[PDB]
Paper text:
The pyruvate dehydrogenase complex (PDC) catalyzes the further formation of acetyl-coenzyme A (acetyl-CoA) from pyruvate, enabling the tricarboxylic acid cycle that sustains oxidative phosphorylation. The PDC is a multienzyme complex consisting of three components: E1, E2, and E3. E2 then covalently links this acetyl group to CoA through its catalytic domain.
We therefore carried out separate recombinant expression of [name] E2 core-forming domain (tE2) and His-tagged PX variants, which could be co-purified by Ni-NTA affinity following brief incubation. To confirm that this binding localizes to the E2 interior, we collected single-particle cryo-EM data of a reconstituted tE2 + PX recombinant subcomplex. The reconstruction shows an interior density that under icosahedral symmetry (i.e., when over-symmetrized) appears identical to that observed in the endogenous preparations. The overall resolution is better, likely due to the absence of the PDC exterior.
Residue numbers in the entry: 227 to 458
Write the structure that this text describes.
Amino acid sequence: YTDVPISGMRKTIAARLKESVTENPHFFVSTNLSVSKLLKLRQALNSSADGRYKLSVNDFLIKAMGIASKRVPTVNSSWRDGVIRQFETVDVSVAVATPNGLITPIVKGVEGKGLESISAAVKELAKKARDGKLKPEEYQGGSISISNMGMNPAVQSFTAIINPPQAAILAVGAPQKVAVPVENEDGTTGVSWDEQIIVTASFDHKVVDGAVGAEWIRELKKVIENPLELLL
């Protein structure tokens, strides 16, 4: 009936996603991260401030992605002319939802940067993405991506398409209350309510195998569920 035409900008993104799904054989690895200690650490770090900063879960996730990509360097790679290009630093592309679609500004040098610097760079790039004032060197590049959907409480889990020429992409669902067993100080078991987040990582099988993706997911889960390991 109504036949509004394609903008032309959508055609390049459609061809790019076509390239991604036709040259990257994707496989997904799902996990559930417990963030009950991460939320307490974020609450303490936000309460011990004078309005200098404001921390979110995405800052801890980007720092944990940097730590996990430094520990497993096979995921921090690409696919080039007969050659695998392996980087040292973790450059994390963060997806920002604008009314003109999707853009991925890059936070450069994630490992050894600082949570306040990460929060400042994410806020700068997000407000500049909403104003539409970016340079091509700010959204062209990166070694790993992350898609965030925590503001929507309906999305329990979702998958994402890998932006070429990267090798992996993360997808973070809304937190939910999951029943987790607990021992009391006597012999019986109990019911405790834990805040869990379903995290799905999509890997390219030409670069990352299933054991390498499982090791990356295990290190990410370790750094998330033990928040004091973000110091190291």
